[PDB]
Amino acid sequence: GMEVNQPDIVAQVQAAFVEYERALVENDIEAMNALFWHTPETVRYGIAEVQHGGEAIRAWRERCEPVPKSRKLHRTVVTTFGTDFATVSTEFTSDATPLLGRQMQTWARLSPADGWKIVAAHVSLIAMP
Template sequence: MTPINDPALVDELTTLYFKYEKALCENDIGVLDDLFWDSPHILRFGATENLYGDEIRTFCQNRPTQDLAREISNLKVVTFGVDTASITLEFCRTINGIFRSGRQSQMWQKLPEGWRIVSAHVSLLPESGKPHR
């Protein structure tokens, strides 16, 4: 039977996720590049875009760099065996002066070069004028 949620792996991936979050909020392209799988098979479905392969890197290089900080809640790390994991969360942030809530999911795979994000999805909830919880 495949072990689910080995505590050491959950800790390792939680640490990696916060490394990703810091890089995302600081627009640290080098770290983001390192954490995403370098493959034409990777995909990131964003709030307004569908990105494949190198399009992710180009998007990160060209996105606005102001007001990227966000508040995270309901962070869940689930590991499957020793080489596959999912990370999901909810977030709140201000975009162009408007408070928005959203959600994010990532699939991580342990590859020869280490843990990498192999699939990502980000979506915003409809505007409501108040946080979604």
């Protein structure tokens, strides 16, 4: 069904999410690719770019500038729906910009074997409200 924030499920998603953040910080491309859905339907809206399909996304990871090592997360919200779906929303700052970063990822577990993956993500920077 759709129990909201079942504790086991919140814990799985937190684990997967913080593993993605490690991959991000270390620019561990293989680890990022393992956790991001890789199909033509995948969409990623990034800070300065738009990517439709896993192939575009992967090609972009190979050439893009890495996240700043000073990246710091703020006000992370992990919300899960039943056992297989979730959203993780966080803000972020770093020394590389005065702007406020926002990141929202939709996570799904499309089969037990596949485990948790990001099926869509949107990242933006805005002036500190």
